[PDB]
Amino acid sequence: TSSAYNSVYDFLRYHDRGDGLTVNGKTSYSIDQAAAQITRENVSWNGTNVFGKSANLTFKFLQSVSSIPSGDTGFVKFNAEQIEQAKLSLQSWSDVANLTFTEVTGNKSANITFGNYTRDASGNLDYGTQAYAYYPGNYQGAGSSWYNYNQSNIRNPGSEEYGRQTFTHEIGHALGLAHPGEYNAGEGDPSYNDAVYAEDSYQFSILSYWGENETGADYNGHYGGAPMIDDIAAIQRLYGANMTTRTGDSVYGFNSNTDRDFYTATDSSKALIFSVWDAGGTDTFDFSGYSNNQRINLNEGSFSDVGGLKGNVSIAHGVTIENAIGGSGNDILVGNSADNILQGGAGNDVLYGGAGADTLYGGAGRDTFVYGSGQDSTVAAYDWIADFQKGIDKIDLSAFRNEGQLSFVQDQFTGKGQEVMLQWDAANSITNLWLHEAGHSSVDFLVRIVGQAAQSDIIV
């Protein structure tokens, strides 16, 4: 098999997990096992051991306090930028789980509160700690979240990414989520070594303490400010999935119509770090503004390498994303079982539509359109390649070698199977590529091509 097919084969297994694997010498958890681990405290605003139940919550920016439940002192109320960013974090949660958030003021009590502190119980300045929060419950301070105003990232969460991230994280605790493992700041000096399972890192959960690098991802110094894939599954386990979110045709990345900063890149220097939740419609990963070689996977639960980062984009369980556009780099685009439109852009790209009737544009450059199986392009649901360049692009059928090397025939099939034919339709200017597969009584594989193709453009 060619390296183009191999490159797809391996990318499809990027960050495989669960199923009794061991990664970094640790036990590997599936999304759902990570999610049960994150929700092990079994507490939510609906009570203890209540799962799959939605909730309507209130939140409040404290303007003063009689005391802070941790004993810390030097209260300072949220400034305008902290308020705007905290609302974005809340929205990043209610986007994915069945939660509503409504602000209250004055003397009304609230499920989730926000406030800063600046000193410890002794009255001494604290410039060391970052933030903390209290689980849902009926006790004094339940749901309250607290942030160290002496940290610039907390004062400026809109310009310092760790601040927004910290907001999303502490709100997570305030909704009932725990760290993926038993560890907390102030309690010795834990590390990724103490992780219960391999996927305990920022790549999978912003509830983690560990950098995405511990799992092989690399965000180049940036912090995603929104729930990651296992966070989404966890919060949904507690409160149910939100099926009203972005149910129209949604575009993520460049030219985004999400009105969400963490899904939006406005120019090539923007870093994207997100796990997408999308509840309906025909959706596109538009990564067209980057020049880096990217690897984009549209399979649910899978990770992509976008914009020069590694493992920075994923798609949540229960989500189907249909289209992808690469950039000017040499990209790999992998579709899912749906009907996908894949656009490689400039650069020399590898596109794989997988199952379903996909429509493929290699764009400029020397592109390869890869078929891993007869089920990729059946007659009943055939692929189109819409911009094929004779003598420049390639169609890769090397995967079929596993059942006998395919041979070309000019205009008739012998019946021995494992033959490929190109047929030119002069009236429409379409080339039909037919493959009569071993074990098939009828000719069941077809890719239609808008343009001419030569025998030497087909890799067998």
The binding site for a copy of itself (CB under 8 A) comprises 30-33, 35-36, 46, 50-54, 233, 236-237, 240-241, 243-244, 300, 317-320, 338, 378-382, 411-415, 421, 423, 425, 427-428, 432, 434, 436, 441-444, 446, 448
Q: For residues 260 and 255, give the distance between their C-alpha atoms in angstroms, rounded to a whole number.
A: 12
Minimum CB distance to a copy of itself, residue 452 (Å) = 17
Stretch that binds Ca ion, among 85-93, 224-232, 269-277, 390-398 (CB under 5 A): 390-398
- Residue for token digits 């400026």? 156
Site string for Ca ion, 245-264 (x = CB under 5 A): -x---x--------------
User: 347 is in the binding site of which of a copy of itself, Ca ion, none (Cβ under 5 to 8 A by kind)?
Assistant: Ca ion
Angle (deg, nearest 10), helices 31-38 and 229-239: 60
Q: Per rule CB under 5 A, is residue 363 in the interface with Ca ion?
A: yes
Establish whether 283 is an annotated binding residue: yes
- Residue for token digits 């600046």? 118
- Residue for token digits 């923007």? 270
Question: Is position 437 annotated as part of the catalytic site?
Answer: no
Q: For residues 208 and 202, give the distance between their C-alpha atoms in angstroms, rounded to a whole number.
A: 6
What would the DSSP string read from start to end of 356-393? Answer: S--EEE--SS--EEE--SGGGSBGGG-EEE-S--TTT-
- The token duo for 93 is 């949660």
HSE on the CB side for 35, CA within 13 Å?
21
DSSP state of 267: S
Calculate the CA 387 to chain-centre distance: 29
H or E stretch at 174: helix 161-175
Minimum CB distance to a copy of itself, residue 423 (Å) = 7
Establish whether 383 is an annotated binding residue: yes
Amino acid symbol at 239: Y
Q: Per rule CB under 5 A, is residue 320 in the interface with Ca ion?
A: yes
Establish whether 186 is an annotated binding residue: no
- The token duo for 97 is 């789980």
Stretch that binds Ca ion, among 116-124, 262-270, 370-378, 437-445 (CB under 5 A): 370-378
HSE on the CB side for 94, CA within 13 Å?
15
Amino acid symbol at 304: S
Establish whether 393 is an annotated binding residue: yes
Minimum CB distance to a copy of itself, residue 93 (Å) = 18
How far separated are the first and last CA of the chain, in Å rounded? 9
Minimum CB distance to a copy of itself, residue 52 (Å) = 4
Of positions 230, 331, 396, 437, contacts Ca ion by CB under 5 A: 331
**Which residues of the chain form contacts with Ca ion (CB under 5 A)?**
246, 250, 278, 281, 283, 320, 326, 331, 335, 340, 344-345, 347, 349, 353-354, 356, 358, 362-363, 365, 367, 376-377, 383, 389, 393
Annotated binding site for Zn(2+): 169, 173, 209
Catalytic residue ranges = 170
Annotated binding site for Ca(2+): 246, 248, 278, 280-281, 283, 320, 322, 327, 329, 331, 336, 338, 340, 344-347, 349, 353-354, 356, 358, 362-365, 367, 376, 383, 393
